[PDB]
Design an enzyme around this catalytic site. Structure first.
Site, PDB file in Angstrom:
ATOM      1  N   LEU A  85     -12.168  10.468  -1.063  1.00  0.00           N
ATOM      2  CA  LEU A  85     -13.327   9.637  -0.668  1.00  0.00           C
ATOM      3  C   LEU A  85     -13.534   9.543   0.852  1.00  0.00           C
ATOM      4  O   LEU A  85     -14.667   9.298   1.305  1.00  0.00           O
ATOM      5  CB  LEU A  85     -13.228   8.223  -1.234  1.00  0.00           C
ATOM      6  CG  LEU A  85     -13.473   8.144  -2.738  1.00  0.00           C
ATOM      7  CD1 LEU A  85     -13.259   6.711  -3.193  1.00  0.00           C
ATOM      8  CD2 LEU A  85     -14.910   8.569  -3.031  1.00  0.00           C
TER       9      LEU A  85
ATOM     10  N   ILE B 273      -6.311  -3.845 -11.766  1.00  0.00           N
ATOM     11  CA  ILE B 273      -6.269  -2.948 -10.600  1.00  0.00           C
ATOM     12  C   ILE B 273      -5.155  -1.913 -10.657  1.00  0.00           C
ATOM     13  O   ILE B 273      -5.355  -0.735 -10.329  1.00  0.00           O
ATOM     14  CB  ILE B 273      -6.144  -3.774  -9.298  1.00  0.00           C
ATOM     15  CG1 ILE B 273      -7.221  -4.870  -9.275  1.00  0.00           C
ATOM     16  CG2 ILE B 273      -6.235  -2.855  -8.077  1.00  0.00           C
ATOM     17  CD1 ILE B 273      -8.658  -4.360  -9.260  1.00  0.00           C
TER      18      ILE B 273
ATOM     19  N   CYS C  98      -2.171  19.705   0.253  1.00  0.00           N
ATOM     20  CA  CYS C  98      -3.621  19.914   0.133  1.00  0.00           C
ATOM     21  C   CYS C  98      -4.017  20.516  -1.223  1.00  0.00           C
ATOM     22  O   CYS C  98      -5.139  21.004  -1.393  1.00  0.00           O
ATOM     23  CB  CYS C  98      -4.102  20.850   1.256  1.00  0.00           C
ATOM     24  SG  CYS C  98      -3.559  20.443   2.974  1.00  0.00           S
TER      25      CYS C  98
ATOM     26  N   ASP D  19      -2.835  -8.713  -5.270  1.00  0.00           N
ATOM     27  CA  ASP D  19      -1.653  -8.984  -4.431  1.00  0.00           C
ATOM     28  C   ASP D  19      -1.087 -10.403  -4.610  1.00  0.00           C
ATOM     29  O   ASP D  19      -0.040 -10.704  -4.041  1.00  0.00           O
ATOM     30  CB  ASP D  19      -1.926  -8.752  -2.937  1.00  0.00           C
ATOM     31  CG  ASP D  19      -2.002  -7.280  -2.564  1.00  0.00           C
ATOM     32  OD1 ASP D  19      -1.523  -6.418  -3.317  1.00  0.00           O
ATOM     33  OD2 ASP D  19      -2.528  -6.987  -1.476  1.00  0.00           O
TER      34      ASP D  19
ATOM     35  N   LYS E 122     -16.404   4.975  -6.160  1.00  0.00           N
ATOM     36  CA  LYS E 122     -15.298   4.069  -6.450  1.00  0.00           C
ATOM     37  C   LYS E 122     -15.235   3.134  -5.236  1.00  0.00           C
ATOM     38  O   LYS E 122     -15.494   3.575  -4.117  1.00  0.00           O
ATOM     39  CB  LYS E 122     -13.950   4.789  -6.525  1.00  0.00           C
ATOM     40  CG  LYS E 122     -13.674   5.542  -7.801  1.00  0.00           C
ATOM     41  CD  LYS E 122     -12.231   6.070  -7.779  1.00  0.00           C
ATOM     42  CE  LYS E 122     -11.949   6.888  -9.055  1.00  0.00           C
ATOM     43  NZ  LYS E 122     -12.649   6.211 -10.193  1.00  0.00           N
ATOM     44  N   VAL E 123     -14.908   1.866  -5.463  1.00  0.00           N
ATOM     45  CA  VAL E 123     -14.820   0.907  -4.368  1.00  0.00           C
ATOM     46  C   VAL E 123     -13.458   1.212  -3.727  1.00  0.00           C
ATOM     47  O   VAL E 123     -12.423   1.274  -4.405  1.00  0.00           O
ATOM     48  CB  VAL E 123     -14.958  -0.556  -4.892  1.00  0.00           C
ATOM     49  CG1 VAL E 123     -14.716  -1.554  -3.750  1.00  0.00           C
ATOM     50  CG2 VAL E 123     -16.420  -0.768  -5.416  1.00  0.00           C
ATOM     51  N   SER E 124     -13.464   1.480  -2.419  1.00  0.00           N
ATOM     52  CA  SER E 124     -12.214   1.875  -1.745  1.00  0.00           C
ATOM     53  C   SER E 124     -12.123   1.246  -0.354  1.00  0.00           C
ATOM     54  O   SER E 124     -12.991   1.507   0.496  1.00  0.00           O
ATOM     55  CB  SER E 124     -12.181   3.400  -1.566  1.00  0.00           C
ATOM     56  OG  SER E 124     -11.132   3.788  -0.666  1.00  0.00           O
TER      57      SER E 124
ATOM     58  N   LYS F 279      -1.727  -7.980   8.540  1.00  0.00           N
ATOM     59  CA  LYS F 279      -1.385  -6.603   8.870  1.00  0.00           C
ATOM     60  C   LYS F 279      -2.486  -5.692   8.338  1.00  0.00           C
ATOM     61  O   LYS F 279      -2.871  -4.714   9.006  1.00  0.00           O
ATOM     62  CB  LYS F 279      -0.063  -6.226   8.213  1.00  0.00           C
ATOM     63  CG  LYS F 279       0.308  -4.780   8.387  1.00  0.00           C
ATOM     64  CD  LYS F 279       1.618  -4.401   7.631  1.00  0.00           C
ATOM     65  CE  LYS F 279       1.422  -4.340   6.140  1.00  0.00           C
ATOM     66  NZ  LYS F 279       2.439  -3.444   5.570  1.00  0.00           N
ATOM     67  N   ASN F 280      -3.053  -6.027   7.161  1.00  0.00           N
ATOM     68  CA  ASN F 280      -4.085  -5.162   6.596  1.00  0.00           C
ATOM     69  C   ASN F 280      -5.433  -5.202   7.306  1.00  0.00           C
ATOM     70  O   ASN F 280      -6.336  -4.440   6.980  1.00  0.00           O
ATOM     71  CB  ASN F 280      -4.228  -5.427   5.084  1.00  0.00           C
ATOM     72  CG  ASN F 280      -2.959  -5.024   4.323  1.00  0.00           C
ATOM     73  OD1 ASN F 280      -2.210  -4.141   4.771  1.00  0.00           O
ATOM     74  ND2 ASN F 280      -2.713  -5.673   3.191  1.00  0.00           N
TER      75      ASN F 280
ATOM     76  N   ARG G 209      -7.307  12.750  -5.145  1.00  0.00           N
ATOM     77  CA  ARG G 209      -6.440  11.988  -4.250  1.00  0.00           C
ATOM     78  C   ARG G 209      -7.244  10.955  -3.464  1.00  0.00           C
ATOM     79  O   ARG G 209      -8.469  11.067  -3.335  1.00  0.00           O
ATOM     80  CB  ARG G 209      -5.775  12.943  -3.264  1.00  0.00           C
ATOM     81  CG  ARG G 209      -5.113  14.107  -3.968  1.00  0.00           C
ATOM     82  CD  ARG G 209      -3.622  14.090  -3.713  1.00  0.00           C
ATOM     83  NE  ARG G 209      -3.373  14.398  -2.311  1.00  0.00           N
ATOM     84  CZ  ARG G 209      -2.170  14.563  -1.774  1.00  0.00           C
ATOM     85  NH1 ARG G 209      -1.088  14.455  -2.531  1.00  0.00           N
ATOM     86  NH2 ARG G 209      -2.061  14.814  -0.472  1.00  0.00           N
ATOM     87  N   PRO G 210      -6.564   9.925  -2.953  1.00  0.00           N
ATOM     88  CA  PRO G 210      -7.180   8.855  -2.161  1.00  0.00           C
ATOM     89  C   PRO G 210      -8.036   9.423  -1.015  1.00  0.00           C
ATOM     90  O   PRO G 210      -9.150   8.938  -0.775  1.00  0.00           O
ATOM     91  CB  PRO G 210      -5.968   8.094  -1.623  1.00  0.00           C
ATOM     92  CG  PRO G 210      -5.029   8.160  -2.780  1.00  0.00           C
ATOM     93  CD  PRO G 210      -5.152   9.606  -3.250  1.00  0.00           C
TER      94      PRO G 210
ATOM     95  N   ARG H  61       8.600  -5.889   5.508  1.00  0.00           N
ATOM     96  CA  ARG H  61       7.513  -5.021   5.950  1.00  0.00           C
ATOM     97  C   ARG H  61       6.151  -5.689   5.850  1.00  0.00           C
ATOM     98  O   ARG H  61       5.189  -5.249   6.493  1.00  0.00           O
ATOM     99  CB  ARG H  61       7.503  -3.724   5.106  1.00  0.00           C
ATOM    100  CG  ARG H  61       8.822  -2.937   5.142  1.00  0.00           C
ATOM    101  CD  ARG H  61       9.047  -2.264   6.500  1.00  0.00           C
ATOM    102  NE  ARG H  61      10.258  -1.423   6.530  1.00  0.00           N
ATOM    103  CZ  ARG H  61      11.459  -1.858   6.901  1.00  0.00           C
ATOM    104  NH1 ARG H  61      11.626  -3.118   7.285  1.00  0.00           N
ATOM    105  NH2 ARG H  61      12.495  -1.030   6.898  1.00  0.00           N
TER     106      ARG H  61
END
Ligand code: 2AN
Length: 419
Positions: free
Chosen positions: A124, A327, A115, A305, A160-162, A22-23, A120-121, A397
């Site tokens: 980036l 993490i 806003c 995960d 940052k690694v995202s 799914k990802n 926040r995520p 899910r």
């Protein structure tokens, strides 16, 4: 509110066929907004976020249909705004922004968390799009992006690694003028899959899977057929299922190279593992696992995960092992529930010190995180007696009918409706 009622102990053995990730399907579905011609995305799991994404794509003017594949026609995308009601259940909706501004010169996405200033995520993603030349406005509950003509390639150092921002920037860069170089890019296999999907449409991308991705922009992307890669965490979960129950399993439709660290850690726990082009076999030869040291870190290192599942493996292993979570140095809600099933562990700082026991006992348990929840179901399979895992919709899910796959391995499990 569905629950799983499990009767243990059961040795889990047999085969399982791994679903598509799914990802990876999510970022690929958003990247399809870039396609001028029809696209068939194969091996897409049937999970809620996929449905949410298809409904959002449709609102933008995309024609979407699905079964095992999802077919997409974005030739006539004609609305460039992802509204609140269609994005409120899925943070991944932000992935519509980059493709829209890159292809059409404008796009906007509703932000349910507001806003207000602060980190926040989305920051980036905004950072990267502004480096590519987009003007970003945060107004009336939306993040809005616009550019006169095409985006322009830039050398972009992510501080940052995202995974999220890497996808946004790499996808938008495919239609920019010039070359984009993303430094500190996320290396996840799902990023590699999204990159290869984009290349299949005509993009030019190299370095995916490494810390540096280079995209040479093109004027337009075409269409085609692409098959989503296997879900590595679902795979790891079933491998652990066999590893903690003295079992033997073969995972079909798998991709071994997405699990180097997991397979190496399972061999340390005593598993006999073999791999093929599209399969992984694990055999415990009826033996209890040996305690291992686990330290989560960004891919290709050990995945967070799989932390809950390896916490369970250590709790029924021979020896004392330590799980360190770097993490989300606080993803331990499965621990107190496993202690109620007889486990022995102490949470200290960002670590869990596990003292393995021979057998767990059934209990009524519950966790919100779907990996912790799936771990509780696996615990029920090997515990003595009856285990009832509540609120399993969280598992639903992220996993397709996990009880059927577990039942095929010998588990005694039943989905009970509203208890
Ligand atoms: O991170 S946001 O960019 O706002 C965001 C963007 C897009 C979709 C979202 C869906 C649910 C919650 C969010 N955030 C949230 C955070 C705190 C309180 C309430 C909602 C979403």
């Amino acid at each position: 509110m569905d629950k799983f009622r499990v009767q243990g102990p059961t040795r889990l053995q047999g085969e399982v066929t791994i679903s598509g990730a799914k990802n990876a399907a999510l970022p690929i579905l958003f990247a399809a907004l870039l396609a001028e011609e029809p696209v068939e995305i194969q091996n897409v799991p049937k999970l809620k976020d996929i449905d949410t994404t298809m409904k959002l794509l449709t609102q933008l003017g995309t024609k979407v249909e699905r079964x095992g594949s999802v077919w997409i026609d974005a030739s006539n995308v004609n609305n460039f705004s992802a509204p609140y009601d269609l994005v409120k259940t899925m943070r991944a909706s932000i992935w519509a922004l980059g493709p829209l501004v890159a292809r059409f010169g404008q796009g906007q996405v509703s932000l349910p968390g507001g806003c207000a200033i602060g980190a926040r995520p989305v920051d980036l993603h905004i950072f990267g799009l502004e480096k590519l030349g987009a003007e970003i406005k945060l107004e009336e509950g939306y993040v809005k992006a616009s550019v006169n003509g095409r985006l322009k390639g830039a050398h972009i150092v992510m501080d940052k690694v995202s995974v999220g921002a890497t996808v946004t920037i790499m996808s938008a860069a495919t239609l920019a003028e010039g070359t984009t170089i993303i430094e500190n890019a996320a290396r996840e296999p799902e990023i590699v899959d999204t990159a290869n999907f984009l290349v299949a449409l005509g993009a030019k991308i190299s370095g995916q899977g490494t810390d540096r991705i280079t995209i040479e922009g093109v004027e337009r992307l075409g269409g085609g057929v692409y098959r989503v890669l296997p879900d590595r965490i679902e795979t790891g979960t079933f491998l652990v299922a066999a590893a903690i129950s003295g079992g033997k399993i073969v995972c079909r439709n798998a991709q071994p190279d997405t699990l180097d660290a997991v397979l190496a850690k399972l061999r340390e726990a005593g598993a006999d593992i073999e791999t093929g082009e599209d399969w992984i076999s694990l055999d415990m030869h009826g033996k209890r696992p040996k305690a291992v040291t686990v330290r989560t870190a960004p891919h290709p290192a050990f995945p967070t995960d799989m932390q809950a599942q390896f916490t369970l493996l250590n709790l029924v292993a021979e020896g004392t092992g330590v799980i360190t979570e770097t993490i989300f140095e606080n993803r331990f809600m499965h621990v107190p529930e496993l202690i109620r099933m007889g486990a022995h562990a102490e949470i200290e700082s960002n670590t869990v010190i596990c003292h393995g026991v021979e057998k767990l006992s059934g209990a009524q348990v519950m966790a919100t995180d779907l990996r912790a929840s799936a771990s509780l179901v696996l615990a029920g399979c090997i515990a003595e007696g009856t285990t009832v895992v509540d609120r399993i919709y969280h598992i639903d899910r992220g996993y397709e009918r996990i009880e059927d796959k577990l039942r095929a391995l010998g588990a005694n499990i039943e989905r009970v409706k509203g208890e």
